[PDB]
RNA sequence: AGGAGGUAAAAAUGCCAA
RNA sequence: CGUAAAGCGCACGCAGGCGGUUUGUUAAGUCAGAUGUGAAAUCCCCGGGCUCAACCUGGGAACUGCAUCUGAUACUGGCAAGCUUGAGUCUCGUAGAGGGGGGUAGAAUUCCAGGUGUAGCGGUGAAAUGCGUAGAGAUCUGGAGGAAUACCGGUGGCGAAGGCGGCCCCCUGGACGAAGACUGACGCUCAGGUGCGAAAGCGUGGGGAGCAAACAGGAUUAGAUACCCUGGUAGUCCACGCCGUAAACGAUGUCGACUUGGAGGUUGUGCCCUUGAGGCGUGGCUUCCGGAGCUAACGCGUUAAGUCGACCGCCUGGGGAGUA
């Protein structure tokens, strides 16, 4: 079943040979992934994250790629969940006892700048703090609403965000990666094959993971 | 050279037929036809050590086949060397 | 110079597990099929097939439990440069019992536990840890 | 994106053990 | 045993070691049972006796061994009949600094004879030695001689290694490819043995342009029997013998099988639309990167230093010493 007109594949010769379970060549020598093995495993993943959605579990979303950051911001607040859409911070989960100290620094400066000391002492240095704020606003985006560690982790590109999959596998976190043919699907538990460089492809997976986790928060 | 004319008489003279180019007796008669042939070549030169090595393979190829044939088929082994005039 | 096809069999088995393959196909024999029976009854493999008439290619089928290989490590002992035979009472034991050792006795190709219980030694082919 | 020419007169050694 | 000590420079090969696959036979090896012996003491075991202990003693266990008889026959071996996949042959072709021999051509240097022509040239950090007014150097014509083969030319090709480069002929090795045919394990490895083996040396007889150990002069320097400069003999060249060593080095022995990929080079070949620098394969060889794995690490990574098999060579702290 063609769920939409893009799942097929990418990278055209830079294929990791440990994705030999799901490949198909084409005229331009590209590796197409066939749907007949991923769309059951796609519907495998959508059931398995509703199991942890019933636990009131915190699900975090990752992926930037300059053209996927837009809807990860959108699909996270679409249900209630959390996301890192901008440039990821290497070492935030396995060193959460040090990135929390900047989260606490954020919620001071988010509180005081939104009303209060934005003028009181130095106008130029008040522009320093709101120059400090908005760069911290995107890097620590929807993480400040969570508190503590997540329970799962839905990735949209295995190769690009390879720090987090290595970081989450240091702890006990089952992750969910949309994998492209160039990456290596070993650290991911619930591997999902499919394209991830087309914008219309990402709105399928983000639209599915949002609407399913809405059903899981009963 | 041991031309296609030259070998075709040898395989007819020794083989079970003309299609029998593989026998032990055919190969030895091919080697002694060539080992004798290059004796004229390796007289005036005597210092071409490179192509002399290809003769020493042809010698040692012949020696291993006779020791196989003697272990196998003694009646034809003492047929060939008096058909060729070799073995010391 | 393929001077020992039994060690070639286990080296196909050992590398076949490390590459996570499905099958391993090799030329057949009388002794190689006799060993592959002892692994099949032991549960170390799935059932084999002897594919061929005159150029017989024996194929195997591997087994993995979680992601690990079912065969931990398999190594030949009586190699063609040094053959080892032992009696009944001086039989070996692999993993203090819970690893097998396929031996060759005059009554046939038997396990370590069987030929000790049948009470006769023979040619110790290889250990399966 | 690719590519050519030109560019230093000599100048040594430093005690034993910590 | 890539770099810590250790792969013979490379090859061929006798003895030696190891050997595909199917069937039958024997039963040597091997395995089973039994008898004979394997002295006792000693050790061990379960017991006993000296107040206990050491000491002494009862029986078993052992003596892992060889020999015999009866067996068992998978495996190895011996014998006999095979088989084809290992090796080998034949047919058609391709590519190549593979080798030996004999020719041959151009550029250039040096020299020789001269023409024109005029004071330097040459060299260097600078200079000097040297050369030049007896006419150099610069230039032109002509001639001789030796040696080497610009461009092509490339981690390109070839060879066992050393190594091999204008072109042409003759003799000649080896590899590779396609579709068929044949022989039937004829195989792998290799002590001793035999063969090849850069450069430099050595011997005889030729050759000698250039280059250049020694040597001389000039500088340099504290000194400089060195770098640098000007010269310059052996030597390098050829024919034939000898020497037998190199960082003779992918510092990695040879053969075979197996185990993710990617970008090229080179040389075959098939099919397809040659329809255009193609499309998809299938072989040989080669370069770089890199996964699992391995490794002390660095790094090797289908051409292993991965996972195994068969033989061979060698290592055992450094010096003394690869010396006496």
Q: Are C63 and C21 in contact (CB under 8 A)?
A: no
Q: What is the DSSP letter of B39?
A: H
Residue C108 half-sphere exposure toward CB, CA atoms < 13 A: 10
Q: Are A179 and A18 in contact (CB under 8 A)?
A: no
**Chain E: bases < 7 Å from a protein Cβ:** 11-14, 17-23, 29-33, 71-76, 83-86, 88-92, 98-101, 159-162, 171-174, 181-183, 185-188, 195-197, 240-241, 255-263, 280, 291-293, 306-311
Q: Quick one: tokens of C125?
A: 């082919």
d(Cα A11, Cα A181) in Å, to the nearest integer? Answer: 7
Which chains share 3+ C-beta pairs under 8 angstroms with A? none
d(Cα A177, Cα A92) in Å, to the nearest integer? Answer: 18
d(Cα C37, Cα C108) in Å, to the nearest integer? Answer: 12
**Which stretches within chain A are classed as H helix?**
35-53, 69-79, 96-114, 123-139, 162-168, 199-216
Domain boundary among C71, C93, C112: C71
- Interaxial angle between packed helices A69-79 and A199-216, expressed in degrees from 0 to 180 and rounded to the nearest 10: 20
d(Cα A154, Cα A164) in Å, to the nearest integer? Answer: 11
Domain range for C96 is 72-129
Cα Rg of chain C, angstroms? 15
d(Cα B14, Cα B29) in Å, to the nearest integer? Answer: 8
Query: Domain check: are C34 and C4 in the same one?
Result: yes
Query: Domain check: are C17 and C47 in the same one?
Result: yes
Displacement of CA B71 from its chain's centroid (Å) = 18
Residue B54 half-sphere exposure toward CB, CA atoms < 13 A: 10
Q: Quick one: tokens of A160?
A: 């690009």
Q: Which nucleotide is nearest to C106 (CA to C1')?
A: E74
Q: Domains of chain B, with CATH numbers?
A: 1-88 (1.10.287.10)
d(Cα C117, Cα C74) in Å, to the nearest integer? Answer: 23
Query: Domain check: are C77 and C67 in the same one?
Result: no
Q: How far is the CA of A91 from the C1' of E200 (A)?
A: 66
Encode burial over B41-78: b for 16+ CB neighbours within 10 A, e otherwise: eeeeeeeeeeeeeebeebeeebeebbeebeeeeeeebe
Query: Domain check: are C8 and C34 in the same one?
Result: yes
Q: How far is the CA of B29 from the C1' of E91 (A)?
A: 18
Q: Quick one: tokens of A124?
A: 């130029």
Residue C22's CATH number: 3.30.1370.30
Query: Domain check: are C60 and C94 in the same one?
Result: no
Residue C117's CATH number: 3.30.1490.10
Q: How far is the CA of A29 from the C1' of E129 (A)?
A: 75
d(Cα B50, Cα B47) in Å, to the nearest integer? Answer: 9
Q: Which residue, among C102, C107, C81, C82, has the nearest Cα to C91 in the 3D structure?
A: C102
Output the 3-class SS for chain C.
Answer: CCCCHHHHHHHHHHHHHHCCCCCCEEECCCHHHHHHHHHHHHCCCCCCEEECCCCCEEECCCCECCCCECCCCEEECCECCECCEECCCCCCCEHHHCEEEEEEECCEEECHHHHHHCCCCEEEEEEEC
Q: Counting beta carbons within 10 angstroms of the beta carbon of residue C4, is it exposed (0 to 12), middle (13 to 18) or buried (19 or more)?
A: middle
Q: Is the dihedral of CA A116, A120, A123, A127 positive or negative?
A: negative
Query: Domain check: are C82 and C100 in the same one?
Result: yes
Domains identified in chain C, total number: 2
3-state percent breakdown (helix, strand, coil) of chain A, nearest 5: 45, 10, 50
Q: Which nucleotide is nearest to A27 (CA to C1')?
A: E279
SS3 A205: helix
Query: Domain check: are C4 and C66 in the same one?
Result: yes
Query: Domain check: are C30 and C92 in the same one?
Result: no
Query: Domain check: are C4 and C63 in the same one?
Result: yes
Q: Which residue, among C80, C13, C82, C79, has the nearest Cα to C48 in the 3D structure?
A: C13
Q: How far is the CA of A110 from the C1' of D18 (A)?
A: 64
Q: Quick one: tokens of A113?
A: 């700048």
Query: Domain check: are C51 and C91 in the same one?
Result: no
Query: Domain check: are C10 and C61 in the same one?
Result: yes
Q: Which residue, among A197, A184, A191, has the nearest Cα to A17 in the 3D structure?
A: A184
Query: Domain check: are C66 and C100 in the same one?
Result: no
Resolution in A: 3.0
């Amino acid at each position: 079943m063609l769920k939409a007109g893009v799942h097929f594949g990418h990278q055209t010769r830079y294929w990791n040979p440990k994705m030999k379970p799901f490949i198909f060549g084409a005229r331009n020598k590209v590796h197409i992934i066939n749907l007949e093995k991923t769309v059951p495993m796609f519907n495998e993943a959508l059931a398995e994250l509703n199991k942890i959605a019933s636990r009131k579990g915190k699900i975090l979303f990752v992926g930037t790629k300059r053209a996927a950051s837009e809807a990860v911001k959108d699909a996270a607040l679409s249900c209630d969940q959390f996301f890192v859409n901008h440039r990821w911070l290497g070492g935030m989960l396995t060193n959460w006892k040090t990135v929390r100290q900047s989260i606490k620094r954020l919620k001071d400066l988010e509180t005081q700048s939104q009303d209060g000391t934005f003028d009181k002492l130095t106008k130029k240095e008040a522009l320093m703090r709101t120059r400090e704020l908005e760069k911290l606003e995107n890097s620590l985006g929807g993480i400040k609403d969570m508190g503590g560690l997540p329970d799962a982790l839905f990735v949209i590109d295995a190769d690009h965000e390879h720090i987090a999959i290595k970081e989450a596998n240091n702890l006990g976190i089952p992750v969910f990666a949309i994998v492209d043919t160039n990456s290596d699907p070993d650290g991911v538990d619930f591997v999902i094959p499919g394209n991830d460089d087309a914008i219309r492809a990402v709105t399928l997976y983000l639209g599915a993971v949002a609407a399913t986790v809405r059903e899981g928060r009963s | 050279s041991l031309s296609t004319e030259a070998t075709a008489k040898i395989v007819s003279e020794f083989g079970r037929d003309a299609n029998d180019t593989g026998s032990t007796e055919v190969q030895v008669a091919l080697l002694t036809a060539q080992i004798n042939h290059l004796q004229g070549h390796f007289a005036e030169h005597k210092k071409d050590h490179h192509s002399r090595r290809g003769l020493l393979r042809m010698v040692s190829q012949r020696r291993k086949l006779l020791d196989y044939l003697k272990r196998k088929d003694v009646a034809r082994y003492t047929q060939l060397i008096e058909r060729l005039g070799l073995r010391r | 110079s393929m001077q020992d096809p039994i060690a070639d069999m286990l080296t196909r088995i050992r590398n076949g597990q490390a590459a996570n393959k499905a099958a391993v196909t090799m030329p057949s024999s009388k002794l190689k099929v006799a060993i592959a029976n002892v692994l099949k009854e032991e549960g170390f493999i799935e059932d084999f097939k002897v594919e061929g008439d005159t150029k017989p290619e024996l194929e195997l089928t591997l087994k993995y439990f979680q992601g690990k290989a079912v065969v931990e490590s398999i190594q030949r002992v009586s190699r063609p440069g040094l053959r080892i035979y032992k009696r009944k009472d001086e039989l070996p034991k692999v993993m203090a019992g819970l690893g097998i050792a396929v031996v060759s006795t005059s009554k046939g190709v038997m396990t370590d536990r069987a030929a000790r219980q049948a009470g006769l030694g023979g040619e110790i082919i290889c250990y399966v840890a």
